[PDB]
């Protein structure tokens, strides 16, 4: 079995289809949004689950089976799985995601100090925050005392949203308070396709 | 108005037992989520009855059971190994006034198959200043550190906060612990009034962290 494409991006109002290869009896479509459980979209190959918007079909024969949305809305976007069935046997497919297309969209950045309560523990994590951006793609550097980290940080991205099509993203650099008390100049740089150039997110003090 | 609910989040050690449950507030299904191997059925039982079918992968470890009196379904995974690590549901299926089908499902279990210790969350707040407003919205959050094992689970406020709320895929740290953020986008004016508190519940550790979130400039 594989399922393909394994992500695409398309336009509100796009046609979208995925396929699905390879001795199936029936096929079945769930939609997995951001954090819920599956949902059964199709069953029996062809068939609408109640309460399924008419822009969704699936169809298929023998070996190759296609899901199709007509219409793409926001609220779809999701991960999509097909699910063969047999023989008392049940296997999913690999997955595809599924994300709008839009214009871009230039991410506000704010910066998070650390707080008081995590300073008197001998640590200090600073927070960088990318909101609302399209597309997915960032740089987004940490600097000292103008010198560049690796790695005491991570990051982290939710999928997208259906309410504007656009991602965030958050960034945490970690450092001891006696590191962090040595330096004074805590930045966050942040390059992306819809800021006019590269944005300096800082703060003094430590 | 049928509802699947499911017991939670387990940690336990390799070679050790588990057992996820499923009430009910056709046959049902047990299905699970795992790193790297995505979703799996594992079996499907017949809830009037307790029949059961296996996938083979599956039959020498599971065992499912029913206990129809209570309506409470039942999978016990033996021999635990890494690879079982993975969010476990229970689903069925049913048909409308109409005739078309659909499922439900559970929230889910995470069961997370470790020799490491637990370790409760620590909450720190995102404090909202003129560094993190865009204008008349703020943002404002927490962020959770050092806790094992997934999953954490963030509310605001009274549980009834979750428009402009982004919680955040947990990450690892230098130290191999977990972290997370969750983060609330607010109208700046409410900042005044509004007092915010995310309420960090780690179920594998018992623990519930309530934090204030205050304003800083």
């Known amino acids: 079995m594989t399922q393909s494409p394994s992500s695409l991006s398309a336009s509100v109002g796009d046609r979208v289809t995925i396929t699905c290869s390879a001795s199936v009896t029936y096929m079945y479509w769930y939609q997995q949004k951001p954090g819920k459980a599956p949902k059964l979209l199709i069953y029996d190959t062809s068939n609408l689950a109640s309460g399924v918007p008419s822009r969704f079909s699936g169809s298929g024969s023998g070996t190759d089976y296609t899901f199709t949305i007509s219409s793409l809305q926001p609220e779809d976007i999701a991960t999509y799985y097909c699910q063969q069935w047999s023989s008392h046997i049940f296997t999913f497919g690999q997955g595809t995601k599924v994300e709008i297309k839009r214009t871009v969209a230039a991410p506000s950045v704010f910066i998070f100090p650390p707080s008081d309560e995590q300073l008197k523990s001998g640590t200090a994590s600073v927070v960088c925050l990318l909101n609302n951006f399209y597309p997915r793609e960032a740089k987004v550097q940490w600097k000292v005392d103008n010198a560049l980290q690796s790695g005491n940080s991570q990051e982290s991205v939710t999928e997208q949203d259906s309410k504007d099509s656009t991602y965030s993203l958050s960034s945490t650099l970690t450092l001891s308070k006696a590191d962090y008390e040595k330096h004074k100049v805590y930045a966050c740089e942040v390059t992306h396709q819809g800021l006019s150039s590269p944005v300096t997110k800082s703060f003094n003090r430590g | 108005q049928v509802q699947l609910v499911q017991s939670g989040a387990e940690v336990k050690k390799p070679g050790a037992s588990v057992k996820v449950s499923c009430k009910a507030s056709?046959?049902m299904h047990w299905v699970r989520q795992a790193p790297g191997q995505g979703l799996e059925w594992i079996g499907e039982?017949?809830?009037?009855?307790?029949?059961?079918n296996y996938n083979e992968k599956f039959k020498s470890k599971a065992t499912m059971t029913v206990d129809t009196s209570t309506n409470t379904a039942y999978m016990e995974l033996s021999s635990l190994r890494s690879e079982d690590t993975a969010v476990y549901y229970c689903?069925?299926?049913?048909?409308?006034?109409?005739?078309?089908?659909?499922?439900?499902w559970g929230q889910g279990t995470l069961v997370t198959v470790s020799s490491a210790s637990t370790k409760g969350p620590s909450v720190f707040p995102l404090a909202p200043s003129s560094k993190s407003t865009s204008g008349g919205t703020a943002a404002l959050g927490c962020l959770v550190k050092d806790y094992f094992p997934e999953p954490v689970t963030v509310s605001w406020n009274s549980g009834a906060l979750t428009s402009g709320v982004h919680t955040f895929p947990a990450v690892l740290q230098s130290s191999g612990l977990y972290s997370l953020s969750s983060v609330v986008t607010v109208p700046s004016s409410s900042l005044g009034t509004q007092t915010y508190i995310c309420n960090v519940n780690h179920k594998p550790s018992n623990t519930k962290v309530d934090k204030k979130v205050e304003p800083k400039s």
């Open positions: 039982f017949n809830p009037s009855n307790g029949r059961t």
């Open positions: 056709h046959w």
């Open positions: 689903a069925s299926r049913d048909y409308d006034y109409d005739g078309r089908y659909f499922d439900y």
